[PDB]
Ligand SMILES: CCN(CC)C(=O)c1ccnc(C)n1
């Protein structure tokens with residue numbers, strides 16, 4: 001992987017592995033999300049962020065701040081097959097005091113065609129109190145050095161899917177998968193649950209018949225609270241709709257505290 | 270990745286990913302096991318096995334037979350750090366009518382030093398009845414074309430750890446992790462639970478303080494029965510001692526054994 005000629009974006013190629021694919025021998029959306037995180041991590045390191053596991057700027061370390069994900073949105077047109085090479089381009093943008101955004105474009109390395117796109121919103125958090133905050137002037141200034149200064153969006157469109165408000169699923173859910181717990185392979189190098197695990201947990205309550213007859217086209221996930229290493233999660237799903245659409249809710253098994261909400265759009269194979 | 274000059278082994282390099290490492294920023298043993306499986310798949314494809322999900326020979330397809338893992342044994346000297354390049358060499362050998370063996374050697378790409386080694390035993394199974402079988406003459410003949418004909422062992426030593434008999438853990442277990450279930454990411458392209466998931470489940474009953482203060486040096490796992498997509502597993506562990514443990518995976522309900530194993534850990 002490497003920064004592009006202008007130093008304002010990063011590209012990396014990946015060969016899809018045998019264990020990375022599902023029943024149709026193409027990459028799962030979790031494999032795609034892991035690749036997005038990997039190229040994101042390589043881009044941050046290339047532009048001078050810390051290499052200790054928390055990816056921070058100089059001003060962030062001084063103020064004890066970290067980035068946390070608020071939303072992840074992925075749209076796939078074609079899932080790469082086992083053995084195919086996928087090329088992913090990523091870049092970041094400042095969003096004033098709100099937070100920052102990371103965007104991605106996936107391409108087939110052979111044809112050069114766009115096979116997917118993704119966008120993510122990140123918000124500042126004090127690492128000690130876990131309280132959200134605004135992005136300060138010094139952090140906005142740091143982002144000018146490695147982000148394009150004119151807008152560059154993976155999802156440019158007027159009222160596009162990546163910016164839609166997601167409602168809260170009301171009981172009873174049409175489908176559910178209960179007692180979901182993370183194991184050590186679900187944790188990152190800082191012992192926090194990997195953001196991709198939540199995608200897998202959301203998907204657990206989709207009936208197997210939908211997965212067998214449909215391909216996932218779009219997934220939008222809001223991150224509200226973190227699932228701790230000793231927490232237990234319930235994944236809930238209700239149909240809201242050729243195309244099938246679902247509303248999702250992840251909550252703690254005991255008290256029902258919300259951890260994530262999302263929506264998925266599936267198209268018949 | 271590619272076959273070596275003689276066409277009797279296969280090599281592939283991998284860059285350790287950010288999500289592939291644990292708290293000490295080095296690859297987990299599950300990441301290592303996934304890389305071993307990946308280079309194994311690439312080797313089978315390069316020597317003409319089927320590309321439909323079940324790596325079979327021509328005679329195997331005709332007889333409705335598949336390979337199934339009986340035992341996995343891994344010894345790690347140094348876990349590669351995040352961003353390091355690890356080179357893995359793999360090869361297979363016929364073991365008469367018993368089954369076949371796949372061996373691996375892991376090396377640091379920069380120093381060229383051996384950082385680990387692994388071996389696995391595979392047994393024939395009829396895909397329809399799920400009954401274990403012996404390896405027939407036609408399958409032994411197919412293996413002569415891509416396996417070294419003189420012995421080549423990752424674990425050559427007399428009476429080495431990879432060949433030890435593993436006892437059955439007796440209740441009560443010292444430690445346990447109950448209600449373990451596979452999710453879709455735990456399944457392979459054929460909708461069977463990935464062999465590496467069982468390693469993670471075994472490790473779930475090791476106390477976190479052992480993981481925080483020790484490095485895993487050796488793991489030997491026997492595979493007895495598969496965990497289905499709708500099954501629930503209990504992971505049990507008892508100290509037998511370096512720290513050494515005896516492990517048992519069993520179905521949550523009836524207590525049917527699925528795996529047994531042993532781990533050896535060194536203080537950091
Ligand atoms: C938390 C850091 N990560 C995860 C790898 C990002 O994707 C990201 C977020 C904000 N800003 C930048 C440059 N990178």
Ligand SMILES: CCN(CC)C(=O)c1ccnc(C)n1
Pocket residue numbers: 306309310313324336337361369371391
């Ligand atoms: C099931 C096939 N796999 C997993 C990819 C092997 O490692 C293997 C086993 C036996 N023989 C050969 C050539 N390869």
